[model samples]
Target chain A: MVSYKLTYFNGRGAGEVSRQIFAYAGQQYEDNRVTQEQWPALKETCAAPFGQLPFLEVDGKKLAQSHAIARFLAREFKLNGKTAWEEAQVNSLADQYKDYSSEARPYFYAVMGFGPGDVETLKKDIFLPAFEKFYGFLVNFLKASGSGFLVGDSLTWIDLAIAQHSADLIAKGGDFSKFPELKAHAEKIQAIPQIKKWIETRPVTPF
Target chain B: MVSYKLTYFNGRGAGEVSRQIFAYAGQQYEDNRVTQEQWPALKETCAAPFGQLPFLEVDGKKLAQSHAIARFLAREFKLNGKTAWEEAQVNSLADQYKDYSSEARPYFYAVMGFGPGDVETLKKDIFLPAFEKFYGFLVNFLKASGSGFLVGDSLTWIDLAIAQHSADLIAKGGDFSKFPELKAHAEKIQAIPQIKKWIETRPVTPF
Candidate 1:
């Protein structure tokens, strides 16, 4: 059995999906949260493989990058997919989400003071238009999956990914109730017992 | 046997790795290229699952997103990795490449006049810093791997992804010869008899 040490800031940002994966898998890991005040110094002298955070150390060897870590855990937990083609579908949804965040996340950073430019303009001009385009594909896929999961019948890591992303949007005051299936899916994932316990207990932050 | 139809722009920007995978695996596919003048209209009637180019149609079902396509092909070709942990390392490299391209690709667009930005500032500020950071992780890994390939002893899809991205950088006036190991690794992949043939015979276009 591989032991995991997860290191990230105290928030539900990129690292939370892996946390929820652990919850769903009923696995134990060392959840090490770095305070924002401590991050700059930590990063300056960090052991991150790619010089970024949310890195997982598996038995003292580091693996970096956010979605890849989540995907690794997903595969280990059998939350990836049952078949090759189904795995491709799972990957497609996560890859699509990654692509969308590449555009939208910078604007999110700007709003949260982690990026430059005026927050309002970035939100109105960048995030909103980008999200409209984002929801079209996500909503269509959610309707197609119909399992209340992102890809296959059981809860996969991507379902948690989409759920967090949608809730993050709602936290930022964008109403996602427009897509009933997605809304229901998010609610369903949130209601999973261990996951609900986690949400109720994790740190409170703006995003 | 799955029939593959790879559809992308007539350039080597994001789609070439899949082509290289097929070449290395001795597989065949319909290498479909759409012209810039034709894509906007073609996309309307096209079967791209995510409304993006560089998607692969496997027996009439579509899989979009370039990295996902490359990874799926890698699995089918048995070029992914020898073990799950090794596969995760391969994924780490590719995901890092994806993160790097998020900053670097837009500069590529500006250089090609596809984006609205001054090219020089974008080059110096955006791509230069981005690639230096990109090279830091990659060069170190290449040194660590000691094999000609990025992940394990045999050539994996990540070796091709790194090689293509490096060639793109050199094509754009970036000097990658500074990292001798990386430069050698790139040349090593290019010298693979089949990949070399494909490189000599494929579409002639910038980027």
Candidate 2:
């Protein structure tokens, strides 16, 4: 077995999907969550490429960037896609969410008291527009795929990522009535026995 | 041969690296550059996966997202990386650039007169800080790689993308004196005869 160690904050913000993937695939790896106080010292020792969290160490080789790490895990575990075209489509959704998350970061941080910004203004000006665009894409794609998953005939990491975000959004009182497909997609993905068990057993956090 | 049709604006913004990949790989593809006036009608007919530009049609199958399309082309052309680990590293860098690009979009639009905000203030508040962090990471990675390429010893599509952005920054009088490795990396990638010829003959745009 390849030695896998994931390092990130204790929150589910960027690291949850990979954890979910590990659960779904029954892959065993180290889940190293660092506290705010521990981050500075850990940062110096971790040697994270790009100086960012949510990086994965595969057999001790570091890979930074959350989406890349998740996709790498998915590919390694044969969860990316069955075909090259499907792989590209899965990647397209991942990039879309990354863009959406970039836009939503400020709103999230503001609401969480970790950053400067009014939550109301951010919701109005940033979060809603980005979320609608993203959810719109996901709804259409899910309907087109008819697979219940985000991509081809089964669960992929993008589904894991999207479903995690959906749970977060709904938890924060986000309205998904406008797009039932998104709600169904999230529900279906989370309904998997492995993922459900993982969720129940995992550490609960606000984010 | 797969019928490849690349659709994007008449600028080197998101579509150039794929074009460079085509040139390097000696692949035949339609370079469809849509004009601003033609976009609304084209967008309606294009059926872009996420209602965005820089989509590629591979044998009538549409794939959206700029980086995803570029990476698909790179993979099809065997330019992604020599190994799976290398591909993941390349993706890490691509995601890093995407994050930087997202932060710099406002500054770019302000400078280009396509959007709001004062260029000077935006530069000070956004571009310089993001650029410094991105370039700092790039300079360190490039030095550590010791291969004169971003991920491995051979040229990947990322080199093309980075070199193009470097050229754009330098064209706007951006200085790279602080990071000699970045300057050299850009110059070396651009000095490729195939890419050099493409740059010399490509349509000029103020992007």
Candidate 3:
């Protein structure tokens, strides 16, 4: 068994996806949360150019970047996809999730006072429209694929991503009731046996 | 031979990366460019909830989304990476590229009056700093990997992305000369025999 150490802050920022994946895969990992003051010392020993939080040390080999860690775990847990086409589809979904997340960043920054916008404009102009588009896409994809899962019949990292983002969207006060398919999809994914068990057992972080 | 038709606008937007990859791998793909006026009608037939332009039709299977098309071609052309680990690294780098691109969107939007800011503030506050961080990361990654390439020893899709972005950065009136390592790396990639040949011979489009 390879030992893994995941470095991140206390919150479920970027590392949450990998954390969920590890838990789902039954892999034991060290969640090394760092404080702001400790970051200076930690920064020195880390791989330079390491962007935000959520760097992972796998078998003593340090790797920075959350997406890298998630993909690594996906490969390790056999959660990527069965065939090359499936893998491509999984990656495509992952990329699309990132795009959606990026679209949401402006709103977050605005909420955090980095942008010039009233809360109403941020909600009406940004969050609602993006969520509606994303929800519609998810609905159509699920319909076309005719599978409970996003890309394949089986669960994938993208599914976990969808679940995480769905929960965040709801918790962030976005109106998800309009998108019945998406809400049902999110609920279905949350009810996955492994995920349900993990959520029950693992430490919870507030978003 | 797989019959593939890639539909996009006349410009080198999202589809250009896949086109470049196909050309680099010595594969032929039908390049179908649509006019702006034709987009609305095509949008109805396109994969619904589509965010932007570019879609790929492979053997009658239509896949919309640029990242999806890129991954499909990367897998088909063996342009991804050698090993599973390499693929993870490539994915990570690609994700980082996506993040960097997202960071620049606000500044770009500011130019279009979407945000209130002078171009100088957009440059000093956003573009230059973001590029610096990205350039620093890229340089360090190249140096650490000891591969002239970004993630692996061989050229991968991430290289294509970097090359494309570098050209765009320069074309956007940014100072490319500031990042010597990135400039040298971009130049090296641009001089790849297949890439050079394609640049000279392939159908040209305004980037």
Tens-digit lDDT track for model 1 on B1-207? 879999999988789999999999989899999998989888798478878889998998888888889889999888888888777888888898888877787787888788878888888989888888888888787777788678878899999888877776666666865676777788889999999999999978876
Q: Which residue pairs come into collision in candidate 1?
A: none
Q: Which digits, one per residue and each the tens of the lDDT, describe model 3 over residues A1-207?
A: 788989888767678889889888878899888887888777776442464677788787767677678877987898877776677677766766666766777777777566777877877788777777777777767886688787768888878878877876777676777777776777888788877787677566665
Off by over 4 Å in 3: A44-49, A106-121, A168-175, B48-51, B106-121, B168-174
Interface RMSD of 2: 0.7
Cα lDDT for residue B179, model 2? Answer: 76
Highest TM-score model number: 2
Q: Model 1: residues >4 Å from true position, as ranges?
A: B116-121, B171-173
Q: Predicted candidate 1: what Cα RMSD to the true structure? A: 1.9
Error of 2 at A20 (Å): 1.3
| Model 1, residue A88: C-alpha shift (Å) | 1.2
Q: How close is candidate 1 to the true structure, as a TM-score?
A: 0.94
Predicted candidate 2 versus true structure: per-residue lDDT over B1-207, tens digit per residue: 779999999998899999999998989899999899999987798478877898999999999999889888899989998899988988999999988988798998888888999989999999999999899888877886899998889999989999889877887899888777888889999999988988898898876
Residues B1-207, model 3: lDDT tens digits? 789888888777677788889888988889888887978787787552364667777787767668768877887788888887787777777767777777777787776576777888888888877888878788877987797898778999888878877877676666867677777777888798888787677666655
Best by lDDT: 2
For model 2 chain B, the run of ten residues with the poorest summed lDDT: B42-51
Give all TM-scores, in the order shown: 0.94, 0.95, 0.88
Between candidates 1 and 3, name the one with more favorable lDDT. 1
For residue A153, model 2's alpha carbon misses the true position, in angstroms, by 0.7
